[PDB]
Amino acid sequence: MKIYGIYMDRPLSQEENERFMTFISPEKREKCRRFYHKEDAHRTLLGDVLVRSVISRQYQLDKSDIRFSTQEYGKPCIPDLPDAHFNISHSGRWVIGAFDSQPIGIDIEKTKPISLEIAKRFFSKTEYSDLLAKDKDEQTDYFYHLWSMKESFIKQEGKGLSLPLDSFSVRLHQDGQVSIELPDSHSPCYIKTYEVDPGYKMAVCAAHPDFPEDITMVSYEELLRAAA
Ligand SMILES: CC(C)(COP(=O)(O)OP(=O)(O)OC[C@H]1O[C@@H](n2cnc3c(N)ncnc32)[C@H](O)[C@@H]1OP(=O)(O)O)[C@@H](O)C(=O)NCCC(=O)NCCS
Ligand SMILES: [Mg+2]
Numbered sequence: 001m002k003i004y005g006i007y008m009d010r011p012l013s014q015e016e017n018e019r020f021m022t023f024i025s026p027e028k029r030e031k032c033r034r035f036y037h038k039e040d041a042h043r044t045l046l047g048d049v050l051v052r053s054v055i056s057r058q059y060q061l062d063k064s065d066i067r068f069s070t071q072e073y074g075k076p077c078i079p080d081l082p083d084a085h086f087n088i089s090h091s092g093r094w095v096i097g098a099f100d101s102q103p104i105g106i107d108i109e110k111t112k113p114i115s116l117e118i119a120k121r122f123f124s125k126t127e128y129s130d131l132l133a134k135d136k137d138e139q140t141d142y143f144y145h146l147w148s149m150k151e152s153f154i155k156q157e158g159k160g161l162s163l164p165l166d167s168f169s170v171r172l173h174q175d176g177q178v179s180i181e182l183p184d185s186h187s188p189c190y191i192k193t194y195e196v197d198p199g200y201k202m203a204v205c206a207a208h209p210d211f212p213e214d215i216t217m218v219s220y221e222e223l224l225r226a227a228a
Contacts, residue, residue, distance in 0.1 A: 001100045001206055003215040004050055005196065006223070008093040012042050016220055020049050023063045043090035046223070050097050051076075053223050055084045058099075062228070073160035087155055094200060096215065102207035105156025107148045109201045114143045122150070144201035149191055152205035156189055 012020065021029050028048055035041040052063035059081060069079045078084055086099045092110030119128060127146050134142045159165065168182040183189055192211040193203045204211065 001098065001104070001208070001210055001212055002054075003096065003098050003106070003194070003204065003212055004054055004218050005097075005215045006046050006050055006095040006218050006220075007197070008042070008046075008095070011039070012045075012220065016224070017042065017045065019224055020045050023052055024048050025068065028068075043095055046095040047088040047090050047097065049223050050095060050218060051078075051086050051088060051099075053218070054097065054099055055081060055086065057227065058084065071158060073158060075155070075158040089151075089155070089202075092200065094197065094202075096196075096202065098204050098206070100206055100208075103156055103158060104207070105152045105154070105158075105205040107151040107155060107203055108196075109144045109148050111140050111144045111199055111201060114140050118147065119143060122147070141201065145193070148201040148203040149193065149205075152191055152203040153189065156205035156207075 021032065024032075024045070028044075032041040032045050035044070048068075049063065052066045055061075055078060056063045056066055066078055067080060068076050071077055076086075076088075078086075083101050084099070085101065085103050086097055087104050087106045088095070088097045089106045089108045090096070091108045094108050094110070096106060096108050098104045098106040114131075119131060123131065123143075123146065127150075131139055131143055131146070154161065157163070157167075159167075163182065167184060167187070168180050169184070171179045171181045173179055187207075189205050189207055190209045190211075191203055191205045193201070194215060196202055196215060
């Protein structure tokens with residue numbers, strides 16, 4: 001497992017953005033072109049180029065070579081490289097990607113004024129009440145702490161928001177109370193949170209507990225490199 005990060009200490013220059021657009025598919029350039037805000041385009045663009053750069057290098061291929069596809073619920077993958085699993089998350093000045101030989105999920109969030117939504121429908125009565133329990137100055141960070149962890153799980157599973165697969169078992173406790181057991185004990189996942197910037201919350205969800213101690217930082221200059 002390896003985690004790479006790109007911190008946009010400065011936006012991409014006119015030329016840098018044109019150079020990177022050159023590595024992606026026509027469909028991706030259109031999607032990038034369509035964003036109202038250039039910083040959303042820059043995040044999607046860099047996330048795409050980071051994956052191309054990391055995986056192509058792993059298989060001595062050219063970034064341009066990679067061909068992406070989308071699984072059933074939209075999770076990206078590279079069909080011709082089945083064991084090169086990855087996941088991207090980007091928020092604010094951060095674009096981060098996790099790579100593993102098994103399904104992986106990652107999430108980074110710029111911390112900002114919370115909104116009851118997601119917090120009401122995406123947070124349990126439990127997570128929600130816990131949150132409102134935090135003091136006002138700790139609510140924003142706590143919200144994103146829980147959310148980054150929760151979304152890393154959902155992004156790792158890939159199956160969207162509705163565990164349909166035979167991924168759960170009904171367990172009965174005292175007086176017949178049910179507890180749903182998930183994930184299946186034989187399909188465990190683990191989460192590790194990383195402190196990369198105080199204005200952000202980040203979490204990785206992997207199929208094994210072997211998380212790298214550090215994230216490898218990549219610059220625009222390293223991503224633009226040819227490296228045959
Ligand atoms: C899970 C989801 C809500 C994440 O949103 P987010 O919190 O805004 O954004 P993050 O920065 O954490 O992550 C975005 C990336 O996650 C990845 N991603 C997309 N769908 C994903 C999914 N179902 N599971 C895991 N990762 C996914 C992508 O690489 C995307 O990067 P990009 O948008 O620049 O191409 C969203 O990715 C999703 O569910 N997409 C499904 C889309 C689909 O199947 N069809 C679109 C039909 S209109
Ligand atoms: Mg997110």
